[PDB]
Amino acid sequence: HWGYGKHNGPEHWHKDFPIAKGERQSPVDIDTHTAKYDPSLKPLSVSYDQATSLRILNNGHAFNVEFDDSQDKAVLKGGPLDGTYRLIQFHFHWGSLDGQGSEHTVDKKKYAAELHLVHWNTKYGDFGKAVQQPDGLAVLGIFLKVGSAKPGLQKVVDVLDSIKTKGKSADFTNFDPRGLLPESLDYWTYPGSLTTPPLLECVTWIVLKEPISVSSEQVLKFRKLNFNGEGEPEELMVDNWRPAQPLKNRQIKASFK
Ligand SMILES: NS(=O)(=O)c1ccc([N+](=O)[O-])cc1
Ligand SMILES: NS(=O)(=O)c1ccc([N+](=O)[O-])cc1
Ligand SMILES: OC[C@H]1O[C@@H](O)[C@H](O)[C@@H](O)[C@@H]1O
Ligand SMILES: OC[C@H]1O[C@@H](O)[C@H](O)[C@@H](O)[C@@H]1O
Ligand SMILES: OC[C@H]1O[C@H](O)[C@H](O)[C@@H](O)[C@@H]1O
Ligand SMILES: [Zn+2]
């Protein structure tokens, strides 16, 4: 099955997921000089005050913090988006060392990690239908750099010892994702794809310009997770990022002048 190793990583995915070589793949490098302010973007609204987190799962690729998406409890609207997008899960991608780990890059610079808050367009009723639509998903991406600790991340860090291996989950109620945001909502946006198989071209990407700072200790705990299942030889969950893909016939727009 697909993964991040030499034998099953990003360079192999196209053999089972031919869209890997598609016209709208993610992530991309964000060339900040070529990105253009877009006056047509509406104000972005991140409305997470009624979010209901449920569970945290090690899926063998990353860990997902899952939300109740049976109503509009935690939604993303505005910006480039037409309609309401409901938060379903968040997860991260990270490196074996602080100099890599992000999926998007900024003028080719790699951050230590990247947070993805995944949302689906409610006009399609369910996530599965949304991933049959060009505008089915919106992913809010946030870079992580290593410096001061992020207080709102610590609850995530501290539960990871209970989901070390693939297939393990734990209750994760009453987590507030607002504690993972930076101060500014300035962003870049472009049309792209899921960054893991099935690589579907359904995503409006919204990538915040301001990184969050996390401590070395916090990211080191991410790197203690395992790709493998319980009882199997240990494969540390590190370098679970896809590199930048060709921009092709796209432009990256900025929310800021
Ligand atoms: N195309 S893939 O990345 O899903 C994939 C890579 C390798 C193997 N393999 O070695 O069996 C299977 C599937
Ligand atoms: N990494 S990502 O945010 O583009 C992503 C989100 C969701 C899924 N998914 O549901 O399969 C895959 C990848
Ligand atoms: O408990 C985490 C969060 O859950 C939300 O549903 C509440 O409205 C927030 O006030 C709270 O911070
Ligand atoms: O034809 C001019 C237009 O070219 C497009 O590629 C740009 O996205 C627009 O901002 C510009 O007004
Ligand atoms: O908010 C997420 C989680 O944080 C801590 O682990 C709390 O002990 C737990 O009750 C909660 O579910
Ligand atoms: Zn992701």
Author numbering: 4 to 125, 127 to 261
Please share text taken word for word from the publication where this structure appeared.
As anticipated, the crystal structures underscore conserved binding modes and the attached 4-substituents are all placed toward the entrance of the funnel-shaped binding pocket. The 4-substituent orients toward the opening of the funnel-shaped active-site pocket and is partly exposed to the solvent environment. A comparison of para-substituted compounds 5 and 15–17 and unsubstituted prototype 1 shows, that for electron withdrawing groups, a gain in affinity is mainly enthalpy-driven, while an electron-donating group in 17 causes a loss in affinity due to an entropic penalty. To reduce complexity, we first want to analyze compounds 1, 5, 15–17, which do not cause major structural perturbations in the active site. A correlation between the pKa value and both ΔG° and kon can be inferred, but not between pKa and koff values. A small set of chemically diverse, only para-substituted BSAs shows that an increasing acidity provides for a faster association process.
In the present study, we conducted a fluorine-scan, similar to the one described by Olsen et al. for the serine protease thrombin, to characterize thermodynamically and kinetically the active site of human Carbonic Anhydrase II (hCAII) by kinITC with fluorinated compounds 3–14. We herein present high-resolution crystallographic and ITC data of a series of variously 4-substituted BSAs with additionally different degrees of fluorination in ortho and meta position of the central aromatic portion. As sulfonamides are known to bind hCAII as anions, a proton from the sulfonamide group must be released into the surrounding medium. The reason for the small detected amount of 0.1 moles L−1 supports the assumption that, prior to sulfonamide binding, the fourth vertex of the tetrahedral ZnII complex is occupied by a hydroxide ion.
